[PDB]
Amino acid sequence: GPMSKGEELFTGVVPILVELDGDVNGHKFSVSGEGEGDATYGKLTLKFICTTGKLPVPWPTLVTTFLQCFARYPDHMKQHDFFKSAMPEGYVQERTIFFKDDGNYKTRAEVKFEGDTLVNRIELKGIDFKEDGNILGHKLEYNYNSHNVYIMADKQKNGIKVNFKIRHNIEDGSVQLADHYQQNTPIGDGPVLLPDNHYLSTQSALSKDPNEKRDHMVLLEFVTAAGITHGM
Numbered sequence: 464g465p466m467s468k469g470e471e472l473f474t475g476v477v478p479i480l481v482e483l484d485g486d487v488n489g490h491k492f493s494v495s496g497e498g499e500g501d502a503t504y505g506k507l508t509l510k511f512i513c514t515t516g517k518l519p520v521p522w523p524t525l526v527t528t529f530l531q532c533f534a535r536y537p538d539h540m541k542q543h544d545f546f547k548s549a550m551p552e553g554y555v556q557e558r559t560i561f562f563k564d565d566g567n568y569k570t571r572a573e574v575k576f577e578g579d580t581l582v583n584r585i586e587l588k589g590i591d592f593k594e595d596g597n598i599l600g601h602k603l604e605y606n607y608n609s610h611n612v613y614i615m616a617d618k619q620k621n622g623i624k625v626n627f628k629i630r631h632n633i634e635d636g637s638v639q640l641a642d643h644y645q646q647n648t649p650i651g652d653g654p655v656l657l658p659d660n661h662y663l664s665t666q667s668a669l670s671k672d673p674n675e676k677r678d679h680m681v682l683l684e685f686v687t688a689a690g691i692t693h694g695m
């Protein structure tokens with residue numbers, strides 16, 4: 464049987480909407496995204512458009528901000544899926560992202576069902592970026608590395624927490640570190656699943672739509688949970 468009501472909402476393909484309101488160093492920008500997710504396979508397919516013009520930061524720096532409820536949790540781990548258990552009312556996802564030797568992003572997002580669509584709505588505030596640094600200078604390669612992140616329960620606040628480092632490839636062969644600190648809290652009062660410590664493993668591919676003239680990103684992602692019971 465299902466371990467939560469929300470688990471049942473993800474057994475097939477679900478449409479996705481993403482809306483981001485951004486302000487980096489006083490530059491305001493907006494991004495809209497559309498696509499589909501299939502948590503049976505842990506797969507996301509998304510297209511984002513900057514509706515205000517050229518995106519003032521590199522697209523790869525926003526990948527983590529733009530849906531962990533679509534992670535594939537194997538049968539033996541479904542009791543640890545906090546993200547689906549918060550649905551349909553959803554969760555708040557908050558992060559500070561510290562870019563080494565550069566500025567920070569602060570983000571607040573709500574992830575929930577609106578009608579039949581899973582919607583991620585984000586406010587982003589970026590401050591203290593260098594005008595000619597890797598971010599505002601668009602020195603990041605248009606690609607993305609794979610990452611394994613360590614999910615832990617926050618029992619006192621009835622949610623989950625995670626810290627992880629994202630590595631962004633730079634055009635000179637160096638790496639720009641983006642240090643993530645993340646807190647997720649349920650929006651509703653209902654019971655949720657608080658997990659044992661485990662990993663989410665993510666693989667992402669970035670591409671372009673050949674028929675899209677606007678500044679945009681196509682994102683394909685695969686996310687799966689992996690446990691550390693080590694029963695052996």
